[PDB]
Design a protein around this ligand. Sequence first.
Ligand SMILES: *Cc1c(COP(=O)(O)O)cnc(C)c1O
Ligand SMILES: *Cc1c(COP(=O)(O)O)cnc(C)c1O
Lengths: 359, 359
Amino acid sequence: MQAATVVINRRALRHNLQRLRELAPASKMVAVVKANAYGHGLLETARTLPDADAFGVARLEEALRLRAGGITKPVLLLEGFFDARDLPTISAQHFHTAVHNEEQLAALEEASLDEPVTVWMKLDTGMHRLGVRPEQAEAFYHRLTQCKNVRQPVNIVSHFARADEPKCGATEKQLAIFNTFCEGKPGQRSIAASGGILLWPQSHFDWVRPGIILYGVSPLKDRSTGADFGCQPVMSLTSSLIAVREHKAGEPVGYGGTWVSERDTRLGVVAMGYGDGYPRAAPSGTPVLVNGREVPIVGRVAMDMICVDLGPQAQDKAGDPVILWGEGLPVERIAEMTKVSAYELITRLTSRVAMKYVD
Amino acid sequence: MQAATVVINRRALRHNLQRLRELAPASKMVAVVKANAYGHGLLETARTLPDADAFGVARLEEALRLRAGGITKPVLLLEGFFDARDLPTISAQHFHTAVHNEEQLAALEEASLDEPVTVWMKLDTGMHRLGVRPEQAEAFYHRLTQCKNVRQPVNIVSHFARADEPKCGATEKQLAIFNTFCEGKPGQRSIAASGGILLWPQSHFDWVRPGIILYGVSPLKDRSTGADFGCQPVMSLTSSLIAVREHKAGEPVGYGGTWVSERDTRLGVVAMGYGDGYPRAAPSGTPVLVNGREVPIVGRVAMDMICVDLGPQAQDKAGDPVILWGEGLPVERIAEMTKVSAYELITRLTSRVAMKYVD
Ligand SMILES: *Cc1c(COP(=O)(O)O)cnc(C)c1O
Ligand SMILES: *Cc1c(COP(=O)(O)O)cnc(C)c1O
């Protein structure tokens, strides 16, 4: 049969990069493809977007994998490098890096490289995750402009912690801090990711870093989907039924007897579970498409299977197509129903899912 | 590798199979290695247990991977085959299969194979997931004994839905149904997995199918660990700190400003997130080991990073060892703290996580 599979629409991917250029017309694009391109495939997603100005990754491993696959464009290390002994590779690879701590800076200062490296000084403007705090940033910044090993000018990067919450003044505060530090400095400026791109046009600056919305999924947490912004969904989590069985009123289904039927019906069993990446937290009632038709999940999601209520004379058959999320069913709707973030849903999938690419 | 890594103890693995043979002394062992051996690695886990009587998998694809890697023991297709055109491979590969529906049985009836196949009729004794219902089982069973394509005798398999809940009579009822159907029939009997093995010695029969407990993790949600049964934990989810930063009181951390500090302190940033498989649901306060000392997670788990509270004058530094779970921190503690099942924690990890094998 066909069991568990992720179908990636290359056409929708292309459409979204172009659509985002329309939303941030004066900014270059850093296609964020970390974590296996949000579950869509690191290398294939990069090869689908040869138009991207650059690619962003979390770790050095991911960037090197890109070069190994023949990706040639600039890759930004969003978290910088974790070992000073990596600088020579970074330099030779032409990898651009963020610099947020003393270790990285002192490494830049003492290293001996055949070529200087393009750098983005990570500023802490409010997220308090990575980055140099304001009161340390000027001195830190000045040391970078004095590096032989750093291409000039030093670029400045930062990230929003609550851009999806327009009513709290978090973003405007980070923007205030970002703007104060960049005054009078050359070099490119970057602080906007999906949220900043869609909701804050003041934060576009020179480079924007689309991640989730690049895949046609909304970064917000209203019921909004990628189509609210003209972005098309790229991923479809699919599978097939491996059984259609009779069931009777009063009888429970799955582990823990979580769901009990109030009527004689027919249950379908899907070749999909959390061993594939489908949330074990999915409550009975969560929507799933069987032969194009919404049916509810009944009972606890197991490691390899999911049961759905088809109906007493439902004519579904072992073999028939199932869509966990996809065309007809945005991953957002599954996020709302299961209470799991769309970011995690599309990303926390296992190596057992097979990967298809269409268009 | 200094970042997301799963360290697998080959020797705790061996200890657990033998310890399970001591707990179920009159039953053969079906080492369940579905879903990439519960996150531990399908092929490596099989190669570590050349003593296993058989291996259990969810899908055909997994069994073929085992043959591809050189694994030669009998492999049991727990859900059977999804396509009739698969019987020829299954026969030739010497795969044993479950048979739960009409399609599979009719396939066996009219296939033409060079060799007959060993079969385990799946009986639905209460789980209502896969299997032939009691009232249809006798006729279905009889057709399998009349099959020239099926190696006689027909074996009988079933699975418990609530064996981890000794107080409800669910297990005794399934056992009652299982026993009634098996009366007078030859062929091996099997109904027990981890729970049945540890809590129900009257369900051991001929073959037991250890899954989660084989990896030294408890099946129950009673706070018990694998060590409660003499089983040693096999997996250690590890990483490293990529930053140690100053923080001030009243300042929030991570997306959504989820956590706010009541004191000046130092925060550590871990190269671990849900893009690796770590639960995004992990609440602030969840334990992590930094330099073998427990510190709490503060703020939201992100796709690639985790922040932890180290203390004001704490001397941990970027590069230092971090343990998400393993040696001084059982995955069962993390499950309780995050309210995520240990089954899902160890299994729903991504391909971003490196794999190490020790001993
Ligand atoms: C992952 C990440 C992004 C992308 O964010 P989205 O909300 O998914 O668009 C951009 N920049 C940095 C620093 C990141 O770590
Ligand atoms: C996966 C499974 C098992 C093993 O279960 P554990 O709870 O990890 O012990 C055994 N038998 C069947 C039918 C299964 O699907």
